[PDB]
Amino acid sequence: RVSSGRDLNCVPEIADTLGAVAKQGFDFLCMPVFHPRFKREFIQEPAKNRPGPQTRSDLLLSGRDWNTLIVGKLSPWIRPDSKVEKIRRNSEAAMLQELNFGAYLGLPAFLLPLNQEDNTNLARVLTNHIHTGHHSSMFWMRVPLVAPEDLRDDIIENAPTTHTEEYSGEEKTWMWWHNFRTLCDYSKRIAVALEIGADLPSNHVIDRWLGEPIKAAILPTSIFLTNKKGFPVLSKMHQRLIFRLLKLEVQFIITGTNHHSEKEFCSYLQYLEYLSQNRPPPNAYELFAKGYEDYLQSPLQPLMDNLESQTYEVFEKDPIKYSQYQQAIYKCLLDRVPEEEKDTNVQVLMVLGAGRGPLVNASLRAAKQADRRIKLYAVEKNPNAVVTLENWQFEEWGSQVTVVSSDMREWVAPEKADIIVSELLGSFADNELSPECLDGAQHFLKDDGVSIPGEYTSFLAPISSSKLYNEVRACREKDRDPEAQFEMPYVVRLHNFHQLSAPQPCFTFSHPNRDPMIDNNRYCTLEFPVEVNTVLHGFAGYFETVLYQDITLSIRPETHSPGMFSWFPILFPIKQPITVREGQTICVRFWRCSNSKKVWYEWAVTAPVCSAIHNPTGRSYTIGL
Amino acid sequence: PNAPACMERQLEAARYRSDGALLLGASSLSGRCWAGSLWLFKDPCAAPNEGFCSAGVQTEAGVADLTWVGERGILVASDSGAVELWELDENETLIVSKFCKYEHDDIVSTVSVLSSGTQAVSGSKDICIKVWDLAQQVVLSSYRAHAAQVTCVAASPHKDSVFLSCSEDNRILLWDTRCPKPASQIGGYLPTSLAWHPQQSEVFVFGDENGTVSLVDTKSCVLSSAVHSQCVTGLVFSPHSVPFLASLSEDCSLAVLDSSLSELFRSQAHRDFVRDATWSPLNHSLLTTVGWDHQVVHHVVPT
Numbered sequence: 038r039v040s041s042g043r044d045l046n047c048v049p050e051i052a053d054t055l056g057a058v059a060k061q062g063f064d065f066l067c068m069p070v071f072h073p074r075f076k077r078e079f080i081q082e083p084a085k086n087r088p089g090p091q092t093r094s095d096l097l098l099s100g101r102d103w104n105t106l107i108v109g110k111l112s113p114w115i116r117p118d119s120k121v122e123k124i125r126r127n128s129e130a131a132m133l134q135e136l137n138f139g140a141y142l143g144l145p146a147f148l149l150p151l152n153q154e155d156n157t158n159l160a161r162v163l164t165n166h167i168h169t170g171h172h173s174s175m176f177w178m179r180v181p182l183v184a185p186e187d188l189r190d191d192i193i194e195n196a197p198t199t200h201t202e203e204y205s206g207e208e209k210t211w212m213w214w215h216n217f218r219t220l221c222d223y224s225k226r227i228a229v230a231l232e233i234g235a236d237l238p239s240n241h242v243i244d245r246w247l248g249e250p251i252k253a254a255i256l257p258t259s260i261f262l263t264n265k266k267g268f269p270v271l272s273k274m275h276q277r278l279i280f281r282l283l284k285l286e287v288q289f290i291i292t293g294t295n296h297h298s299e300k301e302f303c304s305y306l307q308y309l310e311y312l313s314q315n316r317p318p319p320n321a322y323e324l325f326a327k328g329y330e331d332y333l334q335s336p337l338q339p340l341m342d343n344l345e346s347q348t349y350e351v352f353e354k355d356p357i358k359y360s361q362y363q364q365a366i367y368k369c370l371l372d373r374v375p376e377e378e379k380d381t382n383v384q385v386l387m388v389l390g391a392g393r394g395p396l397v398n399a400s401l402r403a404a405k406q407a408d409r410r411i412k413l414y415a416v417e418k419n420p421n422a423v424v425t426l427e428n429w430q431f432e433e434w435g436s437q438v439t440v441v442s443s444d445m446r447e448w449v450a451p452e453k454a455d456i457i458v459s460e461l462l463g464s465f466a467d468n469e470l471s472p473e474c475l476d477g478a479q480h481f482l483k484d485d486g487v488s489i490p491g492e493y494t495s496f497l498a499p500i501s502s503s504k505l506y507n508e509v510r511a512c513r514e515k516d517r518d519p520e521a522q523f524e525m526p527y528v529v530r531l532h533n534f535h536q537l538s539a540p541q542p543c544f545t546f547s548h549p550n551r552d553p554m555i556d557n558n559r560y561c562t563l564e565f566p567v568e569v570n571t572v573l574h575g576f577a578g579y580f581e582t583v584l585y586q587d588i589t590l591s592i593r594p595e596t597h598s599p600g601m602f603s604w605f606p607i608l609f610p611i612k613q614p615i616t617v618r619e620g621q622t623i624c625v626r627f628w629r630c631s632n633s634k635k636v637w638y639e640w641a642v643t644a645p646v647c648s649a650i651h652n653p654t655g656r657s658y659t660i661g662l
Numbered sequence: 663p664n665a666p667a668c669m670e671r672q673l674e675a676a677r678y679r680s681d682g683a684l685l686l687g688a689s690s691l692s693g694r695c696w697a698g699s700l701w702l703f704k705d706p707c708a709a710p711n712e713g714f715c716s717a718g719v720q721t722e723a724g725v726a727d728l729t730w731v732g733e734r735g736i737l738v739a740s741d742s743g744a745v746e747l748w749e750l751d752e753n754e755t756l757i758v759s760k761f762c763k764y765e766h767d768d769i770v771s772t773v774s775v776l777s778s779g780t781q782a783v784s785g786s787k788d789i790c791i792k793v794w795d796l797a798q799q800v801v802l803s804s805y806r807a808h809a810a811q812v813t814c815v816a817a818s819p820h821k822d823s824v825f826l827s828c829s830e831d832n833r834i835l836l837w838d839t840r841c842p843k844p845a846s847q848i849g850g851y852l853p854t855s856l857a858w859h860p861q862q863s864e865v866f867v868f869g870d871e872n873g874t875v876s877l878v879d880t881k882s883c884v885l886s887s888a889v890h891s892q893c894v895t896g897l898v899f900s901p902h903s904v905p906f907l908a909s910l911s912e913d914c915s916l917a918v919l920d921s922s923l924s925e926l927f928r929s930q931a932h933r934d935f936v937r938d939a940t941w942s943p944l945n946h947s948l949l950t951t952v953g954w955d956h957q958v959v960h961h962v963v964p965t
């Protein structure tokens with residue numbers, strides 16, 4: 038149910054050791070590839086000429102076993118950053134040798150420690166290795182939650198432990214990691230093995246780490262407590278962190294010696310399994326989202342592009358959305374047609390963007406529950422979906438052209454409407470061009486006609502996510518601007534990330550819009566209070582919409598309509614990550630720009646430093662009218 | 663005759679006892695099987711020939727350190743993270759396990775018997791230092807004083823509660839376990855080896871990773887000599903009353919120094935790393951050294 042390896046620093050026979058460990062229930066073995074005490078000379082005679090096999094043979098395991106079962110460990114004497122020149126050079130040579138052997142064996146991962154501040158040379162050797170030959174070992178950088186220097190016992194009589202609240206202090210190990218991965222240029226091969234100790238830092242510290250690429254969490258045997266029955270278990274605080282780490286499908290590694298000697302061994306594992314079988318179960322949204330975690334997609338342009346049959350089908354299988362549309366229209370039919378007027382008053386309802394008809398059936402469902410009468414028009418421009426409508430029309434219905442195959446901005450309406458009903462909203466509300474589409478249909482809304490929805494508002498929040506920054510680089514394409522990938526949004530089920538400040542409103546649009554200008558262009562300045570040292574990699578986007586009065590849809594996380602599938606957040610990247618200190622304000626500026634052919638967003642950070650303006654003139658990203 | 667067939671290549675430890683017999687420990691640090699052995703040579707000059715030895719045995723894992731405990735007993739720091747007590751049988755033909763306790767979380771790097779011979783301290787790559795009761799076969803105390811690997815521990819000659827430790831955190835800690843805060847720091851290049859003076863309660867030598875040997879007084883900074891071109895692995899004071907200091911190193915050389923740290927002997931007999939040195943109790947100017955080149959060398963030290 039949960040994936041876990043065993044960390045050993047002692048392996049007398051590889052086969053007996055792997056077998057014992059496979060028996061215990063572990064999936065892999067982190068072990069040394071050279072003996073951890075077998076220091077080697079590369080320069081000075083006579084020890085450079087030490088004979089004999091430098092380590093054990095690749096033939097001791099199958100290729101399949103090397104490729105799936107074994108994580109290598111850098112030798113603990115290797116100190117590329119030593120202040121002694123001879124050790125620095127032996128260590129350079131020895132690190133390339135052990136990495137080369139790991140590549141030679143096809144290991145899936147290799148563990149290197151970040152156990153001090155200055156890892157510049159470590160970084161530079163690993164970077165050279167990555168740029169040498171054709172190999173695809175992952176590099177797991179073993180970094181503690183708490184530096185050893187900060188969890189030492191206060192038993193040195195003339196060197197006491199720094200006592201009071203030391204604020205950037207128990208964030209030192211994050212800066213170790215950040216300096217290292219910045220030196221290595223955010224390489225996608227360099228991830229984190231986070232080593233957990235007896236004590237824990239801030240919820241904020243643990244929050245930053247969960248925006249970082251954690252592939253493994255390392256649990257020492259020593260941090261486990263004992264229950265009555267004599268089994269190993271964890272503090273309620275350590276249980277919280279497991280619960281969060283399981284929510285990133287990280288691998289668990291058990292390190293150190295057996296400390297529960299009445300209770301066999303595999304019991305540490307048994308306990309991780311226990312915690313795992315015993316988290317709250319996925320909600321409806323979490324089940325459906327599984328598979329989409331940090332997968333970047335192009336936002337749909339349903340105006341420019343004719344949606345596929347199977348795209349409509351995911352938007353249709355969203356009962357809570359159509360349930361809320363049904364209620365909004367019901368409440369509208371009741372405010373519009375008094376009870377005396379019940380059977381004389383036919384309300385004219387038009388569905389604008391009817392697709393394959395679910396808002397039409399919502400309008401019907403509404404009409405029976407409100408017991409008022411309606412005359413229905415369904416306007417769709419996608420002639421593919423028009424086939425689905427016109428077949429349903431000729432088969433059911435039989436009365437009225439109902440379905441009209443037309444762009445709602447050209448359509449000559451037989452008649453003015455009481456109510457226009459539409460769902461032309463993307464992940465950023467107005468990025469499917471709802472404003473332009475409704476402004477062009479407005480002229481056939483009666484002077485007191487209602488638009489459902491009546492309002493929407495986009496929201497933004499700054500984020501950190503070094504995974505999401507790499508998914509964006511990976512979007513570089515031949516034959517365009519090498520930076521174009523950063524100047525466009527992505528619909529993405531944001532997962533491996535940190536929300537740096539609470540969402541605030543960006544752009545609002547009302548319908549109908551009787552301001553004699555409309556002007557759907559927009560400029561907004563947003564100030565985000567921050568409270569960690571972090572990297573800004575971009576802004577998450579969300580929206581909310583008023584369908585009618587108090588009937589709303591949201592994907593803003595704090596008001597998220599429960600169990601609603603149709604829309605994941607959007608991400609606006611920035612080209613260069615921006616360091617932010619605790620206490621600093623992130624200032625961001627968004628424009629909604631347009632000409633008669635295109636709408637786009639430009640955006641810039643102005644605090645605590647300026648970015649370049651992103652997407653100037655829609656040079657990298659436009660939404661076609 | 664008597665023991666395992668093939669003693670492992672990498673000679674780690676050599677220590678004479680009172681009657682002049684040689685204790686050898688070894689690891690295999692390469693090849694299929696990464697393990698360890700103990701040997702008694704009631705004739706030094708034969709060693710390391712397995713056939714013509716008095717006793718020996720297979721350990722589960724590598725031997726990183728060991729020390730004699732009195733006459734019968736051998737105390738072992740294992741790669742397995744275990745501290746082991748082995749003992750000679752009455753006939754000193756067999757070496758039997760008395761205890762194997764897995765209490766450290768990584769390799770045990772260094773071990774040292776206290777004053778009284780009843781207790782011992784271990785240091786480990788797990789960063790911890792531990793005080794053992796050898797009769798009760800339990801850890802009495804565990805200290806996380808250091809911020810990195812423990813390179814060396816060294817029991818005081820005469821005081822059970824006092825010993826030195828040093829670490830890759832650039833600290834030399836002087837410990838007295840009768841204080842609430844038992845450790846005190848003493849002034850670097852990383853310290854790599856420790857020995858107490860056998861005639862001054864107050865004094866000790868330390869070797870650094872850069873090849874310098876340093877003489878330190880508790881009472882008082884230092885006095886120093888650039889003796890080696892790399893890591894000082896070991897410092898063992900000779901058994902004389904104005905004693906010599908044997909220094910060994912990864913530069914594959916042994917030096918013997920006077921009390922002013924001036925050079926008297928130098929040997930390049932070794933072709934790999936020199937791991938240990940022990941002075942004959944019969945002939946206070948026989949010095950025996952061992953190395954990863956599998957040589958046991960017998961030097962006559964000019965005195």
Ligand SMILES: Nc1ncnc2c1ccn2[C@@H]1O[C@H](CN2CCCC23CCNCC3)[C@@H](O)[C@H]1O
Binds near residue numbers: 337339393418461463
């Ligand atoms: N000017 C026009 N005139 C008429 N029809 C128009 C437009 C602009 C868009 N459409 C259509 O509206 C529908 C919107 N669909 C329905 C479910 C999925 C969704 C809504 C949520 N976001 C993704 C698209 C589609 O069927 C479009 O083809």
